């Protein structure tokens, strides 16, 4: 869950950095339709899903 918190802190930024119409639009659409972050280091991951 600690490396998992690190992976949460990474993955959202990593997918949002890749800005391609072929990919980014639909991928973040389908993400935000069901986006979720599992608890790790308290509310830090809670901030992750807050933005």
CA distances to 10, 18, 39, 40, 49 from 2, in Å = 12, 25, 10, 7, 17
Tokens of 18: 């890749």
Q: CB within 8 A of 51, min separation 6: which ones?
A: none
CB 45, CB 5: distance < 8 Å: yes
Resolution of the coordinates, Å = 4.5
C-alpha 46: how far from its chain's center? 11
Q: What is the chain's Cα-based Rg?
A: 12
Q: CB within 8 A of 45, min separation 6: which ones?
A: 5, 8, 37, 38, 39
């Amino acid at each position: 869950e600690q490396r998992f918190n690190n992976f949460l802190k990474a993955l959202q930024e990593k997918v949002e950095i890749k800005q391609l119409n072929h990919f980014w639009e639909i991928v973040v659409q389908d993400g935000i339709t069901l986006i979720t972050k599992e608890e790790a280091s308290g509310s830090s991951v809670t901030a992750e899903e807050a933005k």
